[PDB]
Design an enzyme around this catalytic site. Sequence first.
Site, PDB file in Angstrom:
ATOM      1  N   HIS B  85       0.744  -0.923  -0.314  1.00  0.00           N
ATOM      2  CA  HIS B  85       0.262   0.011  -0.177  1.00  0.00           C
ATOM      3  C   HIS B  85       0.865   1.044  -0.191  1.00  0.00           C
ATOM      4  O   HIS B  85       2.129   1.581   0.870  1.00  0.00           O
ATOM      5  CB  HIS B  85      -0.303  -0.241   1.281  1.00  0.00           C
ATOM      6  N   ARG B 171     -15.426  12.459   8.547  1.00  0.00           N
ATOM      7  CA  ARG B 171     -13.623  12.545   8.158  1.00  0.00           C
ATOM      8  C   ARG B 171     -13.454  13.286   7.368  1.00  0.00           C
ATOM      9  O   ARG B 171     -13.201  14.757   8.550  1.00  0.00           O
ATOM     10  CB  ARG B 171     -12.925  11.677   8.623  1.00  0.00           C
ATOM     11  N   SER B 186      -7.791   3.268   9.356  1.00  0.00           N
ATOM     12  CA  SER B 186      -8.767   3.303   8.517  1.00  0.00           C
ATOM     13  C   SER B 186      -7.474   2.452   6.956  1.00  0.00           C
ATOM     14  O   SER B 186      -8.208   1.644   6.392  1.00  0.00           O
ATOM     15  CB  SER B 186      -8.916   4.879   7.504  1.00  0.00           C
ATOM     16  N   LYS B 190      -8.916  -1.557   5.258  1.00  0.00           N
ATOM     17  CA  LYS B 190      -9.040  -1.722   3.584  1.00  0.00           C
ATOM     18  C   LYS B 190      -8.310  -3.074   4.159  1.00  0.00           C
ATOM     19  O   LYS B 190      -7.839  -3.977   2.821  1.00  0.00           O
ATOM     20  CB  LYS B 190      -8.607  -0.828   2.375  1.00  0.00           C
TER      21      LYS B 190
HETATM   22  C1  LIG Z   1      -5.479   9.302   5.030  1.00  0.00           C
HETATM   23  C2  LIG Z   1      -6.651   8.529   4.188  1.00  0.00           C
HETATM   24  C3  LIG Z   1      -6.373   8.395   2.699  1.00  0.00           C
HETATM   25  N1  LIG Z   1      -7.647   7.572   2.685  1.00  0.00           N
HETATM   26  C4  LIG Z   1      -7.243   7.269   0.951  1.00  0.00           C
HETATM   27  C5  LIG Z   1      -8.251   8.124   0.849  1.00  0.00           C
HETATM   28  C6  LIG Z   1      -7.646   8.841  -0.116  1.00  0.00           C
HETATM   29  O1  LIG Z   1      -8.062   9.808  -1.572  1.00  0.00           O
HETATM   30  C7  LIG Z   1      -6.052   8.840  -0.578  1.00  0.00           C
HETATM   31  C8  LIG Z   1      -4.750   9.580  -0.023  1.00  0.00           C
HETATM   32  O2  LIG Z   1      -4.884  10.192   0.972  1.00  0.00           O
HETATM   33  O3  LIG Z   1      -5.915   6.672   0.773  1.00  0.00           O
HETATM   34  C9  LIG Z   1      -8.266   6.702   3.317  1.00  0.00           C
HETATM   35  O4  LIG Z   1      -8.857   5.391   2.659  1.00  0.00           O
HETATM   36  N2  LIG Z   1      -8.273   6.607   4.560  1.00  0.00           N
HETATM   37  C10 LIG Z   1      -7.872   7.871   4.875  1.00  0.00           C
HETATM   38  O5  LIG Z   1      -7.907   7.498   6.505  1.00  0.00           O
END
Ligand SMILES: Cc1cn([C@H]2C[C@H](O)[C@@H](CO)O2)c(=O)[nH]c1=O
Lengths: 436, 436
Positions: B85, B171, B186, B190
């Site tokens: 990631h 958020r 977060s 995933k």
């Molecule tokens: C900071 C953050 C980013 N993201 C994902 C969606 C954002 O558009 C992308 C880049 O910051 O990664 C999350 O799903 N959760 C998070 O807490």
Amino acid sequence: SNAMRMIDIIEKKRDGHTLTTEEINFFIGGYVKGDIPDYQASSLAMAIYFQDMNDDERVALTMAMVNSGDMIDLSDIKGVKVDKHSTGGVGDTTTLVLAPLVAAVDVPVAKMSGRGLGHTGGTIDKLEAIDGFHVEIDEATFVKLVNENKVAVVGQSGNLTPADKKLYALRDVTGTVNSIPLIASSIMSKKIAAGADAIVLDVKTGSGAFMKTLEDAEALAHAMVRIGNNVGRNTMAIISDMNQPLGRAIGNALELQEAIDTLKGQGPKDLTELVLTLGSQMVVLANKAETLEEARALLIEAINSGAALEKFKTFIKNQGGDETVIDHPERLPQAQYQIEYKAKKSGYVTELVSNDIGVASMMLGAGRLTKEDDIDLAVGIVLNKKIGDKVEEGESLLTIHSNRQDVDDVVKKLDSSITIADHVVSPTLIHKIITE
Amino acid sequence: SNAMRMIDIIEKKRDGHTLTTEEINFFIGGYVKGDIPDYQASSLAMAIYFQDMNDDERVALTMAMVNSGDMIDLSDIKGVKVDKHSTGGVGDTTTLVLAPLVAAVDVPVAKMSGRGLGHTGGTIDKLEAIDGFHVEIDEATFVKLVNENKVAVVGQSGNLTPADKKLYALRDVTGTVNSIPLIASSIMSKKIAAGADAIVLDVKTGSGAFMKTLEDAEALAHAMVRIGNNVGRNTMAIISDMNQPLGRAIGNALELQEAIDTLKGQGPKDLTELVLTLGSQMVVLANKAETLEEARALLIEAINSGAALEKFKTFIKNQGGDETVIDHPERLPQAQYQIEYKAKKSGYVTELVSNDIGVASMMLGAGRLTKEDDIDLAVGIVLNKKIGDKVEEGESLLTIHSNRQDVDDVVKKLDSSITIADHVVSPTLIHKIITE
Ligand SMILES: Cc1cn([C@H]2C[C@H](O)[C@@H](CO)O2)c(=O)[nH]c1=O
Ligand SMILES: Cc1cn([C@H]2C[C@H](O)[C@@H](CO)O2)c(=O)[nH]c1=O
């Protein structure tokens, strides 16, 4: 965009920065209109809870909420209209005495009160113990009454500080009630919106108070005084004790009887002292005396000469009540059953948990859970002992005034609320008098 | 009651206390069901922003969000499925190289990718530059492909971590994105939900990164590593530089060409080094080497022997693509117009603002604003100079690949993004390698 402006305001406060007056106005106006969602308002409130607001922010918030609704214009009432606000407490029967008392020394009492929810009725419920009394008077009538008699009472207007109704309700379900800038702006907005030229605050402290510690009560009092003075509604405060109920009566007609006694200089000593302290501030604020001591003299003379009580009768008479009841309060609503509650052991009363005595009274029918509940004006509790009083096993701690035979659940609530142990002093009632 | 339980959780965290696993589960489950309102969720998030969460809380939050939706079961794919990631960045063409490269050393790449929004297409958009390529394969086919070839790619499942989709969106509109426990839970939710046995994190730092400072990038990397290890999905991280775009190509087919070059050991030096660093971690995590240095040797041999590129062809072939394009990438989609963008002065390139170069590429058609926008796979930017490279007035800084004649607005965006001044060193690409 609305969304981005509000995100920027939330992050700004979160990051510890001061909000501009325009940013605060945008938030409140937008929130009250439905354009800014509850979830953004709560986030801002939580950011405020941690990061606080300076006086300029607090004043902007206060005034934005004032400007969300009704601004009551009392300018046609002659003199300086001073209003008292109490953060609240079981047995707080001061307004009943203060309205005729202060009026009797030529201070205009243009009072807006209510009914409402709580352990006991609101001031208007209590006054409705007098046959005929009502608050169905129009604007011009209220103004005329205060100009002619220096006292009148109406109920709540229809749309005072809607931004605050909405924000306080939100605060209560999102962990953001207990923040000084939010409390101070909330309380002050309603008093300013109601038209007060000057404001006296009774900020309770102790276990039966909103602000349990003296330090927190002081912080809140000073914060409200600074708001008022900054907006030009001269404001003073007292910090008073609520480690036990004030006075003896907790109820509706029962509290009216105690008010009548106090207005004749025969009331409980605590209630009398709080009345004279708050009254003295009100008299000075209304420019009817130069010093607190001069004000207190005026008030005691009003009581002693009969003028205070006579003013209560004029007040009641002028709004439909049978004022002869004031002279013969034995004719007030009386509970069918008067049940003594006796001390289980000898000693001294050391603890009276105010809120639970309030619940006990409420459970007899003295107050409402819902706007649809009915109050029994006759019922309540009369305390026969206060903290520091000697009591013997089998002597009456208090009298339960009930219109039902079964008061088992009221008695168990009282059981949890009273402690008898070895000697203690009466707690100090007036902790602080604030003029800045 | 739902309301009171959530009020108590909000106040508890607000007051600095640790939440129980049950309290966290109650919040996430209730929120995702619609039983706990957005306005209570935001207030809790803001309380978390200030008061933080310990590792046990962070793991409970991560797993509650995992458990809100799909948990992809990859157990029928043999070996240790390691997933990478990246927090993201302009020119990040690592996944294109890493999938065939790592597979070519016998590490299973069971990749879930997407299309999506951004300056350029998602990995699947880029791969669709190859005629015939598609990700319309079923579960059993994905499993078979990874078992037989060690690589396959599918698109997003239908319901991964719905609690996180909902909470991240909230958020983003309530000032609560930038909180370590919320970011860490977060991102990790995933990756864990998608079935990864082990996780490699590329945490960017610098002006083109989410975590602009090295200290903040480190804090976030360690926080995610501790979550993964605690739940038993072995996790490592790198902190890599994003003070300028990675590599040279910023686009779709253009990035695929650069991936092809790298897979033959002819790619940009920066992209190559990041690939080898992340790949080495993945190889060790998959138990295909004992040390990073041994892993790097394997990978370089895979590139040098032709195995890496051949694996890319097998991958493309097995999902419908014309793999002969990999051998002849000159047949990839080509933009009609290749416009040189020249240095206005001599010196050294000292600044390349990544995000704005990304916007410039996007404005040619390289990426989407809305799920309904179409991407032009041919278009983009190829940088001919990076930070620390010498440039003379009139020499090409980069080439604009456009399918429209008018690129005036792309050129002005590039103008704001490039600084030429006196000599500087190339910034260090790999700042930190984290194994705890
Ligand atoms: C900071 C953050 C980013 N993201 C994902 C969606 C954002 O558009 C992308 C880049 O910051 O990664 C999350 O799903 N959760 C998070 O807490
Ligand atoms: C603390 C607080 C109380 N109040 C009112 C409503 C409460 O039920 C009452 C007693 O705390 O006073 C406000 O309107 N705003 C406030 O911020």
